[PDB]
Enzyme design. Sequence first.
Site, mmCIF file in Angstrom:
data_model
loop_
_atom_site.group_PDB
_atom_site.id
_atom_site.type_symbol
_atom_site.label_atom_id
_atom_site.label_comp_id
_atom_site.label_asym_id
_atom_site.label_seq_id
_atom_site.Cartn_x
_atom_site.Cartn_y
_atom_site.Cartn_z
ATOM 1 N N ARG A 15 0.833 -1.209 0.000
ATOM 2 C CA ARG A 15 0.000 0.000 0.000
ATOM 3 C C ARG A 15 0.867 1.259 0.000
ATOM 4 O O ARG A 15 1.804 1.365 0.787
ATOM 5 C CB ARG A 15 -0.949 0.013 1.213
ATOM 6 N N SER A 103 -8.121 -0.562 -0.557
ATOM 7 C CA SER A 103 -9.091 -0.952 0.497
ATOM 8 C C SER A 103 -10.100 0.154 0.927
ATOM 9 O O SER A 103 -10.921 0.622 0.126
ATOM 10 C CB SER A 103 -8.379 -1.643 1.711
ATOM 11 O OG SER A 103 -9.333 -2.323 2.561
ATOM 12 N N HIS A 104 -10.033 0.554 2.191
ATOM 13 C CA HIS A 104 -10.946 1.538 2.759
ATOM 14 C C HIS A 104 -10.276 2.930 2.844
ATOM 15 O O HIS A 104 -10.868 3.888 3.359
ATOM 16 C CB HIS A 104 -11.357 1.061 4.155
ATOM 17 C CG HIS A 104 -10.225 1.052 5.143
ATOM 18 N ND1 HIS A 104 -9.287 0.041 5.195
ATOM 19 C CD2 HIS A 104 -9.874 1.938 6.104
ATOM 20 C CE1 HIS A 104 -8.413 0.299 6.154
ATOM 21 N NE2 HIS A 104 -8.748 1.443 6.722
ATOM 22 N N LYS A 113 -3.153 -6.733 -3.180
ATOM 23 C CA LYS A 113 -3.367 -7.924 -2.390
ATOM 24 C C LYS A 113 -3.026 -9.105 -3.302
ATOM 25 O O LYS A 113 -3.440 -9.128 -4.467
ATOM 26 C CB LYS A 113 -4.791 -7.964 -1.845
ATOM 27 C CG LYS A 113 -4.988 -7.009 -0.665
ATOM 28 C CD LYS A 113 -6.451 -6.770 -0.349
ATOM 29 C CE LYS A 113 -6.561 -5.690 0.728
ATOM 30 N NZ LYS A 113 -7.935 -5.584 1.320
ATOM 31 N N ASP A 237 -16.984 -2.112 2.825
ATOM 32 C CA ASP A 237 -15.812 -1.280 2.677
ATOM 33 C C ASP A 237 -15.477 -1.151 1.186
ATOM 34 O O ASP A 237 -16.129 -1.788 0.330
ATOM 35 C CB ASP A 237 -14.651 -1.829 3.515
ATOM 36 C CG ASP A 237 -13.926 -2.967 2.851
ATOM 37 O OD1 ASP A 237 -14.520 -3.664 1.988
ATOM 38 O OD2 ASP A 237 -12.745 -3.178 3.207
ATOM 39 N N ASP A 239 -13.282 -2.137 -1.039
ATOM 40 C CA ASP A 239 -12.993 -3.240 -1.967
ATOM 41 C C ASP A 239 -13.894 -4.478 -1.835
ATOM 42 O O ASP A 239 -13.815 -5.398 -2.652
ATOM 43 C CB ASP A 239 -11.496 -3.577 -1.998
ATOM 44 C CG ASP A 239 -10.995 -4.162 -0.701
ATOM 45 O OD1 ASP A 239 -10.141 -5.077 -0.761
ATOM 46 O OD2 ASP A 239 -11.451 -3.708 0.370
ATOM 47 N N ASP A 241 -14.290 -6.835 0.661
ATOM 48 C CA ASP A 241 -13.918 -8.026 1.463
ATOM 49 C C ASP A 241 -14.353 -7.909 2.937
ATOM 50 O O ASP A 241 -14.109 -8.805 3.760
ATOM 51 C CB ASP A 241 -12.433 -8.364 1.330
ATOM 52 C CG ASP A 241 -11.531 -7.234 1.770
ATOM 53 O OD1 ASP A 241 -12.045 -6.213 2.269
ATOM 54 O OD2 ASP A 241 -10.296 -7.369 1.621
ATOM 55 N N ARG A 242 -15.067 -6.829 3.218
ATOM 56 C CA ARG A 242 -15.530 -6.497 4.554
ATOM 57 C C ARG A 242 -17.000 -6.072 4.503
ATOM 58 O O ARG A 242 -17.428 -5.393 3.552
ATOM 59 C CB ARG A 242 -14.683 -5.351 5.063
ATOM 60 C CG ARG A 242 -14.224 -5.463 6.464
ATOM 61 C CD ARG A 242 -12.740 -5.074 6.608
ATOM 62 N NE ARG A 242 -12.447 -3.681 6.283
ATOM 63 C CZ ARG A 242 -12.815 -2.627 7.010
ATOM 64 N NH1 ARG A 242 -13.526 -2.782 8.125
ATOM 65 N NH2 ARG A 242 -12.490 -1.403 6.606
ATOM 66 N N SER A 322 -12.232 -6.929 12.534
ATOM 67 C CA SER A 322 -12.224 -5.899 11.499
ATOM 68 C C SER A 322 -13.366 -6.080 10.492
ATOM 69 O O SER A 322 -13.667 -5.169 9.738
ATOM 70 C CB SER A 322 -10.862 -5.842 10.787
ATOM 71 O OG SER A 322 -10.512 -7.115 10.244
ATOM 72 N N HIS A 324 -13.752 -8.936 8.332
ATOM 73 C CA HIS A 324 -13.530 -9.980 7.329
ATOM 74 C C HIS A 324 -14.145 -11.295 7.782
ATOM 75 O O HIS A 324 -13.841 -11.785 8.873
ATOM 76 C CB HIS A 324 -12.051 -10.205 7.120
ATOM 77 C CG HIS A 324 -11.370 -9.093 6.398
ATOM 78 N ND1 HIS A 324 -10.893 -7.969 7.039
ATOM 79 C CD2 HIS A 324 -11.041 -8.952 5.093
ATOM 80 C CE1 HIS A 324 -10.325 -7.171 6.154
ATOM 81 N NE2 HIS A 324 -10.395 -7.748 4.968
ATOM 82 N N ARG A 416 -2.798 -5.207 22.959
ATOM 83 C CA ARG A 416 -1.926 -5.489 21.841
ATOM 84 C C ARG A 416 -1.375 -4.184 21.264
ATOM 85 O O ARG A 416 -1.837 -3.093 21.614
ATOM 86 C CB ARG A 416 -2.635 -6.351 20.776
ATOM 87 C CG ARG A 416 -3.821 -5.701 20.098
ATOM 88 C CD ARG A 416 -4.321 -6.546 18.930
ATOM 89 N NE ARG A 416 -3.297 -6.777 17.899
ATOM 90 C CZ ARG A 416 -3.175 -6.069 16.775
ATOM 91 N NH1 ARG A 416 -4.005 -5.062 16.522
ATOM 92 N NH2 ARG A 416 -2.223 -6.371 15.895
ATOM 93 N N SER A 418 -0.853 -1.724 18.154
ATOM 94 C CA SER A 418 -1.254 -1.398 16.811
ATOM 95 C C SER A 418 -0.076 -1.585 15.856
ATOM 96 O O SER A 418 1.031 -1.122 16.136
ATOM 97 C CB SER A 418 -1.773 0.024 16.748
ATOM 98 O OG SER A 418 -2.092 0.350 15.420
ATOM 99 N N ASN A 419 -0.315 -2.258 14.732
ATOM 100 C CA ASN A 419 0.735 -2.489 13.740
ATOM 101 C C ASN A 419 0.998 -1.272 12.853
ATOM 102 O O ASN A 419 2.094 -1.117 12.310
ATOM 103 C CB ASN A 419 0.408 -3.713 12.879
HETATM 104 ZN ZN LIG Z 1 -11.363 -4.285 2.288
#
Ligand SMILES: [Zn+2]
Length: 458
Positions: A15, A103-104, A113, A237, A239, A241-242, A322, A324, A416, A418-419
């Site tokens: 991305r 994506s979003h 992807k 979203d 694309d 996939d969500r 998220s 998915h 956790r 955040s990445n």
């Molecule tokens: Zn997506």
Amino acid sequence: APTLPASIFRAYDIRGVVGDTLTAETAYWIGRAIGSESLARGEPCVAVGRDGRLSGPELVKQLIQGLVDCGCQVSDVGMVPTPVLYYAANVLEGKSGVMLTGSHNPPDYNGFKIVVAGETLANEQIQALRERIEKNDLASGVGSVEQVDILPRYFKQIRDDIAMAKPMKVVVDCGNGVAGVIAPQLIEALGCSVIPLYCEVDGNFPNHHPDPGKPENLKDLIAKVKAENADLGLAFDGDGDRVGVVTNTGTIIYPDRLLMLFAKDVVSRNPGADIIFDVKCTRRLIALISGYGGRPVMWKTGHSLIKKKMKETGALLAGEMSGHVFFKERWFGFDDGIYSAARLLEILSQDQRDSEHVFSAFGSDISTPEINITVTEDSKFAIIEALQRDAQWGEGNITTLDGVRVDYPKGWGLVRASNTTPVLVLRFEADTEEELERIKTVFRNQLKAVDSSLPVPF
Ligand SMILES: [Zn+2]
């Protein structure tokens, strides 16, 4: 080959900003890396799709040329949702697929992807593509391009398999993303009345951004559902996939609650089936899967990681917070918001209760909203590691797959890193208020043991 910015090679995708960190030249060499990697795994045949972004129709030309310059046979499926590309990579000759999507994200972003010979790439597999470019470790050949019209086939596949019992009235919000090409039409064909919101494909995103994950992007959906006395609202979203879900009374149904219902259904036809969810998903989901005779498997967040885990375990269903949702039963095992929408409508159409009551019947526990603590990029992972090393949790069942999750008999907590941001992400749940305060206290104390200065907003 030239020097590409490493920062665009992310954990589960590529991305960047078009014209900036992601240029035409960049996209070409990525095609070249992806094409060489696919050939090395014995797959010359690669499907290519684009979402509805402004930079899509021109920028895919470089990706396709990259692949072609390897010797690959490219099947160009045009502008399609992300899961429709995954679909092409399952039903066409080749098992390789590239989706040009951002994506979003805001309009200027795009990316890739990647599926190579059945395998969705992540982490080191993605760094290996960058490394191929840098090393000039690239295939050379005279490739091939073929136009393939795949959407009617996808449409027919879902329609043929879904059996709705009663008509429903459904608001559908695509947020001007690419799901508008198929979602309202598919749902109509299932036997619903569709009230379209933002279904014109517009890469400017003139209304809200197509990100069902931020509640403010659901306001128009909720207002429309209520005003039209509709039976359900669906938000995709960018694309596709969500999927986001709201009930007839405008209640937001989070993905783990959505999973509860899908799991009940999938497990009912499949005794002993594995069902995957991530560390952010409610404990109730663990109990529920087990109670129905399924095998619960907690895994890491990340579409590529869930999809891998599904192949490894034979799981018939997976989902993550998220949004998915991955069906393998009756399907192919990739995340697909459009197919999940159909599977949800199928179940709901078979219940005489409204959607508000189907979901509320699962009941509740005492739950916090997701809590964010901004830290630094320097200290982010080191705090998680300090916890994983020194924290005292008592009798909790500790999971360190992704941050530190602790499951107690009467509740759980997670922390956790955040990445993508300098942030610690927490969630807590318990069956009473007194128990929730005990678990919060355990996490507050263990964070303060790391750094007595840490801002703990709980
Ligand atoms: Zn997506």
